[PDB]
Amino acid sequence: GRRRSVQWCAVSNPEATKCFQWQRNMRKVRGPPVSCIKRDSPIQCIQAIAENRADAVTLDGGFIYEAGLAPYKLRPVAAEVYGTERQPRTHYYAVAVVKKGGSFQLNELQGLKSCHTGLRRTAGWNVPIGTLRPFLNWTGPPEPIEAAVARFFSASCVPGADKGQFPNLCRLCAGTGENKCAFSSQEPYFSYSGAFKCLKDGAGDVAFIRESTVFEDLSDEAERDEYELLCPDNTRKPVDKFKDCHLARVPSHAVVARSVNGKEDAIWNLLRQAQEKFGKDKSPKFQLFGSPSGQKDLLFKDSAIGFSRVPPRIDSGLYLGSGYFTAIQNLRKSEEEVAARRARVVWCAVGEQELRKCNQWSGLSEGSVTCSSASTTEDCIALVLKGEADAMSLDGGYVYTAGKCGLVPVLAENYKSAQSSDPDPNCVDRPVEGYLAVAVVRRSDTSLTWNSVKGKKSCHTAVDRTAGWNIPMGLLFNQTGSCKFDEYFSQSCAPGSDPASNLCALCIGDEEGENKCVPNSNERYYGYTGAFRCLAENAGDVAFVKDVTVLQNTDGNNNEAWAKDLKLADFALLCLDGKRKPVTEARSCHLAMAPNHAVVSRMDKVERLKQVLLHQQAKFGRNGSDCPDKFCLFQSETKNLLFNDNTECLARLHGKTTYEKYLGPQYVAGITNLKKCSTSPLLEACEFLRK
Numbered sequence: 001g002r003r004r005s006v007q008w009c010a011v012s013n014p015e016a017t018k019c020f021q022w023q024r025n026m027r028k029v030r031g032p033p034v035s036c037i038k039r040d041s042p043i044q045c046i047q048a049i050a051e052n053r054a055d056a057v058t059l060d061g062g063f064i065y066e067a068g069l070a071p072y073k074l075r076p077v078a079a080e081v082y083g084t085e086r087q088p089r090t091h092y093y094a095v096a097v098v099k100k101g102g103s104f105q106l107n108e109l110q111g112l113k114s115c116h117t118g119l120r121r122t123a124g125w126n127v128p129i130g131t132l133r134p135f136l137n138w139t140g141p142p143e144p145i146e147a148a149v150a151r152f153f154s155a156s157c158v159p160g161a162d163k164g165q166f167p168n169l170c171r172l173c174a175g176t177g178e179n180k181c182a183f184s185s186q187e188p189y190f191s192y193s194g195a196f197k198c199l200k201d202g203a204g205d206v207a208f209i210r211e212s213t214v215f216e217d218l219s220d221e222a223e224r225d226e227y228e229l230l231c232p233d234n235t236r237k238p239v240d241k242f243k244d245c246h247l248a249r250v251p252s253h254a255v256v257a258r259s260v261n262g263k264e265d266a267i268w269n270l271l272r273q274a275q276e277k278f279g280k281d282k283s284p285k286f287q288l289f290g291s292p293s294g295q296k297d298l299l300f301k302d303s304a305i306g307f308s309r310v311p312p313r314i315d316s317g318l319y320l321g322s323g324y325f326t327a328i329q330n331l332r333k334s335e336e337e338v339a340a341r342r343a344r345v346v347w348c349a350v351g352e353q354e355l356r357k358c359n360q361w362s363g364l365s366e367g368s369v370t371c372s373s374a375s376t377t378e379d380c381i382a383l384v385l386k387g388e389a390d391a392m393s394l395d396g397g398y399v400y401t402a403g404k405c406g407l408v409p410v411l412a413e414n415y416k417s418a419q420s421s422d423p424d425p426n427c428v429d430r431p432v433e434g435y436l437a438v439a440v441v442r443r444s445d446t447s448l449t450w451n452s453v454k455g456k457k458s459c460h461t462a463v464d465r466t467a468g469w470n471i472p473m474g475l476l477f478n479q480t481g482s483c484k485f486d487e488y489f490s491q492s493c494a495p496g497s498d499p500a501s502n503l504c505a506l507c508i509g510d511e512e513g514e515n516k517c518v519p520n521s522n523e524r525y526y527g528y529t530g531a532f533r534c535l536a537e538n539a540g541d542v543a544f545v546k547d548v549t550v551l552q553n554t555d556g557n558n559n560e561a562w563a564k565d566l567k568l569a570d571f572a573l574l575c576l577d578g579k580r581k582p583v584t585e586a587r588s589c590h591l592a593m594a595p596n597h598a599v600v601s602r603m604d605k606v607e608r609l610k611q612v613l614l615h616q617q618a619k620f621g622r623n624g625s626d627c628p629d630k631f632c633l634f635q636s637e638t639k640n641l642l643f644n645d646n647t648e649c650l651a652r653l654h655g656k657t658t659y660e661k662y663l664g665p666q667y668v669a670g671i672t673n674l675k676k677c678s679t680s681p682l683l684e685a686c687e688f689l690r691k
């Protein structure tokens with residue numbers, strides 16, 4: 001009775017005239033309120049937003065990019081949905097439409113005339129120009145890419161272009177006066193329908209719009225027949241074959257809002273009702289997805305079917321997709337700065353200590369490796385998704401999440417074998433054998449068995465790692481089907497959980513006592529070395545780690561203060577049969593076999609990644625040319641920074657090149673079951689981007 005409104009930002013008069021009826025019917029039916037704001041452009045609307053004079057606006061992919069840049073930092077909150085109620089989709093295709101009768105393919109457009117939807121729009125600009133780049137002889141900056149297309153076509157209509165500098169880009173626009181080639185409806189050849197009309201009138205030879213335009217604007221089925229599409233493989237096809245002939249599959253326009261004090265429920269509360277009441281044939285009083293007779297797409301795309309909420313972890317970069325997002329950024333770069341970026345491998349580092357090591361490695365790589373960093377593994381996977389980082393080594397737990405996200409395993413960390421190989425010259429081709437997940441306890445604790453571990457104090461590598469969480473919690477879950485994971489044990493140190501939770505009561509933080517329960521190396525109780533440490537310092541009663549962990553931190557194998565004096569004979573293993581065994585019989589006393597930490601990446605980087613890695617280990621490997629004279633890839637002494645200190649080499653996958661194949665049927669069924677108790681913001685973001 002004081003959240004007075006969700007201030008919509010309008011970009012024209014008709015828009016505002018559309019947004020007011022909107023408001024008139026909203027309160028008429030007692031729906032949530034919405035007041036209108038006026039401006040003259042998408043850019044003006046982005047700015048009104050960033051500075052609280054409006055709350056939301058639906059933009060095209062091209063302006064989502066721009067709205068997401070600092071100093072604006074808007075976020076897409078709701079996606080338009082297209083198709084029909086039975087096959088809704090939150091994506092569309094950018095096609096290149098032509099008239100039947102000619103015989104020019106997509107590689108033969110130089111000197112033709114073109115119609116575009118507007119400067120910087122997905123289908124009318126970003127997509128067609130990026131596809132065409134090979135043909136433009138562009139020199140890269142500072143010469144604007146606009147200049148290169150202006151020499152490309154004889155004439156065009158590119159609403160918003162600078163008439164000034166690029167008269168050619170404005171030649172075919174139909175506006176009258178200063179309206180000629182403006183970025184609004186005053187310009188008849190603006191947007192999907194203006195671009196399509198520029199083609200129809202015989203003003204341009206190709207139109208760069210969306211797959212529906214031809215169907216929306218040509219009523220009668222036979223009129224459409226006068227049209228064809230230019231496919232990327234230099235073939236023409238019927239207009240309805242868009243699926244097999246499009247220049248790109250793109251994210252749907254979306255409503256953006258502020259990242260910080262955005263008013264996200266108000267917006268969604270409003271949209272949700274509006275769709276219901278005034279959606280696709282619901283009210284002859286007012287139509288949310290339709291325009292008065294002289295207009296097109298006021299406020300929203302005509303013939304959209306509703307909205308789809310965008311999960312909170314999503315930002316512009318993630319919304320656009322690595323392909324699209326990077327393609328946009330590549331419009332402002334030379335072909336040389338772009339090829340240099342394709343050749344280079346950017347590593348994602350989890351914590352300062354991994355960054356430091358990565359920096360070290362960076363300088364010795366003769367320009368092949370660079371560093372990016374984040375404070376959680378999840379944040380690094382997000383960075384690889386935005387194309388902003390390319391790779392990292394991951395626990396099988398995280399390869400699940402990464403694979404759900406469409407990433408792929410490329411090389412695996414190889415460890416000593418079932419005692420085959422000696423100081424193995426064929427370690428890159430020696431198939432991986434899994435590591436053993438164990439439950440360790442102090443020998444003194446005579447009474448501690450698997451059977452009575454529950455309710456005790458536990459130490460975990462981190463939430464969602466194989467040895468440290470999936471295996472122990474999975475086995476336990478399987479006995480009571482309870483999802484109340486913070487009740488399995490009285491207290492714990494399970495990094496990456498809520499620090500206000502039981503699950504974090506034993507974490508001790510970094511050397512100063514900050515960073516408690518964070519899922520990176522600043523928490524002294526993190527990972528393998530840290531969950532072991534949690535045991536040896538008597539914080540916990542059981543540590544869920546791997547068997548070589550104990551070997552490595554006892555018998556003067558780790559001189560660090562806390563470790564110095566630990567003897568193997570003091571720790572024992574819990575077997576699933578009730579028994580306890582010495583650490584050396586882990587092979588007959590373990591919880592499960594865990595898939596090897598694997599390095600993951602985007603599909604586009606696989607083959608270049610493979611080569612940099614092979615090359616780099618040949619030199620900084622276990623038995624490598626510069627280790628230890630200068631740098632050792634695989635050593636950080638007990639720290640397990642970037643890779644596990646016991647990696648012999650990075651070996652080949654043998655065909656298992658998908659998270660499913662790599663991890664195994666059984667592993668994947670299990671996590672999948674656990675995940676049902678709770679998913680992360682990240683898995684929610686990726687389900688959304690995958691439909």
Ligand SMILES: *[C@@H]1O[C@H](CO[C@@H]2O[C@@H](C)[C@@H](O)[C@@H](O)[C@@H]2O)[C@@H](O)[C@H](O)[C@H]1NC(C)=O
Binds near residue numbers: 137148
């Ligand atoms: C682009 O430059 C083309 C000619 O140059 C060379 O061969 C062609 C096939 C390209 O691969 C190019 O990169 C090579 O330098 C010209 O034929 C063409 O007319 C160029 N420029 C424009 C916009 O016309």
Ligand SMILES: [Fe+3]
Binds near residue numbers: 060061121123253
């Ligand atoms: Fe668009």
Ligand SMILES: [Fe+3]
Binds near residue numbers: 465594597
């Ligand atoms: Fe692991």
